[model samples]
Target: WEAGMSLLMALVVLLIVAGNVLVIAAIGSTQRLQTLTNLFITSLACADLVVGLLVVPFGATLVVRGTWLWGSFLCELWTSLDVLCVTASIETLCVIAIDRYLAITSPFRYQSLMTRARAKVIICTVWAISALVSFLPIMMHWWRDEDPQALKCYQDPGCCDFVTNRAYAIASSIISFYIPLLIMIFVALRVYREAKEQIRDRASKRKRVMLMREHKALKTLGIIMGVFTLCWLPFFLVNIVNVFNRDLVPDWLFVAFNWLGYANSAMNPIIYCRSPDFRKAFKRLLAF
Candidate 1:
């Protein structure tokens, strides 16, 4: 079972890496496809690319070995980058959701609100915020500090084990995941209602059909947000449980939940590939 799981993880890592790379390249090269929302998507793809390049390779190696044999400094770096990249990816999703909401709610003004210059500013801000939140705690000694000749590198037995800093953990999770999720939910609900109302006003059969198609496209944004919430919820719940019942939690459970958290990075490409525009862009890029 261990070997099979490791192989499965390796496959997922490869697929996600390739898929997200294609996503980034496709969006970057296509002028017609470049919009404010695509800018957020590009940022997301870049974040996922970092995960694939740094985290997944190391993680797959550790999974096969069943432990982290690397020394303390490398371990700390790995853990910090893992946190930074994953947090950035989730935050990018929130940005995408907000961008989508603006596009749908204020179509005429969206171009003004989400101009290329503004998108550049937002992307820079997201990365700065992610880096600060992820690595600053390490510098502050909120996480495990390097010690001499520790048998294990990580704080817990898991590969990317964070220290038992409940305040930092909770704060990080809330800022990176929960808050974005809540805002996305609210915005998506409003977008859905507005789309439905717009569809209702189209009296002609052909116009109604087009409106329904547009509504479906808008709803796809909600589906993406919903899937993201579901994928990350288990990992956060485990963290919450560990905060309260740290002593009783099993080592295997800790490792399992940690991997579960990383698994979402792999799932994102699958979600993206299901989009028609994504598929078209992917195929066009591949043809060249």
Candidate 2:
């Protein structure tokens, strides 16, 4: 089972890295694809890129061994990074939905309000907030009531091997998971609510192109959120449930949900493949 899991983790790492790199390259290679939506996607892919590059590999070691052989220092750092990348990814999805909403509902207003500079600022703020939720609590040991221990290593199959109390679990879960989930759900509702109106509205050639892009973006957003909710919901629910009753969540179940989140990171590029612009770019990149 351990050997099988190791092989599976390696494949997951490969797929995640390759998939996100494909997204980054697709957006880079195409001129028309350089819209605000794709920019937000690139930001998302970068977060997922970090997950594949740092989080998953480190996590795989923990998963296979069921022990933190790397010592307490790396353990803390690893836990911090795990949250950072995932939080940023979740937040970016919220941004994407909001950006699409603006564009679909009021194109001219979106044009005026959304710019590359502002988008860059938003992306930075997302990461900054993610860092706060992750590094601030973990490094300061604010997530747990117990004093820091100079333990050599940990003995758990969970990648986030640190012992966190209920307060930190609820706080981090709200910040890193539930809040974003609510925001995305709200924005998605708004987007779909406006979708009917958007289709009825018509315009010139450029306007038609804009409409098509808006519709496509809206559909893509739907799939992305569907997958996002499906993947992370289990993990966060287990996280909350375990805080009150630690044994309620079995180790296998917890680890399974953890990888489910990683699976979501890898799934994004596959989702993007459904977008015509991305599909064309991907074809060009692969020369197929």
Candidate 3:
């Protein structure tokens, strides 16, 4: 059973890596999708690609093995990078939500407000913010020393093996995941409410007509946000639990949540594949 599960997870990880790679290639090759939104999407795809390629496979291996045979320092390195990539991806999503809100609410002003130059600046800011939030804790020595029994002696000496620091864990969780999640939810609700109000007083026939036209656009945004929230909620919840009650979450539960979080990276390309623009770009890349 363990071997079979490992194989399944390995396949999933490979698919995610491949899918995100395709997205990055597609965006790079397609000149037609050089819009501000696509710029953010491209940034997101790149982050997911890193997470899938660098983080998930190692995590799956750890899960299957049930013990860290890679030495303590390497464990810390893996965990830190995992946190950083996931945080970067989540923060990018928040930026994307804001970008979409601007596009919808102020289409005319969006171009003026978020030019290509401004988009590039924002992308840089996103990466900087992600790096600071993810790596600051480690630099501050928030990780505790590893237990002797918990340590695995490997051929290669690891850098530093430390247990999770409670303070750093809480701070990282709230800043990286929860805050962005709240922002996304608030923006989505505002967009939906505003859309509904615009057509509320119209004649019934006109209202229906306008709503029918708006339906697909609204649904697309909602689905994207929904999938993001669903995929990430479990992982954040586990973090929240660990923050208040460190012993409350079991080891297996943590492993499960970690996998769930990693799955978000892979799931994103699947979501993009559903979109016609992305699909067209993907097909064009395949042809080339």
Go through the candidates in order and give the C-alpha RMSD of each one to the true structure. Answer: 3.6, 3.6, 4.2
Q: With candidate 1 superimposed using the best TM-score fit, by how many Å does residue 259's alpha carbon deviate from the native?
A: 2.3
Per-residue lDDT of model 2, residues 237-262, tens digit only: 88888877776777888889889898
Which lDDT values do the candidates have, in the order given? 0.72, 0.81, 0.71
Question: Candidate 2 or 3, higher TM-score?
Answer: 2
> Stretches of candidate 3 above 4 Å error?
1-8, 145-162, 198-218
Error of 2 at 141 (Å): 0.7
Model 2's C-alpha root-mean-square deviation from the true structure amounts to 3.6
Clashing pairs in 3: 73-159, 73-160
The predicted structure with the larger TM-score, 1 or 2, is 2
Candidate 1 runs further than 4 Å off: 1-7, 145-160, 205-213
- Measured with C-alpha atoms, the lDDT of residue 16 in candidate 1 is 66
Better of 1 and 3 by lDDT: 1
Model 1: per-residue Cα lDDT at residue 41: 77
Single out the weakest 10-residue window by summed lDDT for candidate 2. Answer: 150-159
Measured by TM-score, how close is model 1 to the native structure?
A: 0.84
The candidate scoring highest on TM-score is 2
Candidate 1 — what's its lDDT? Answer: 0.72
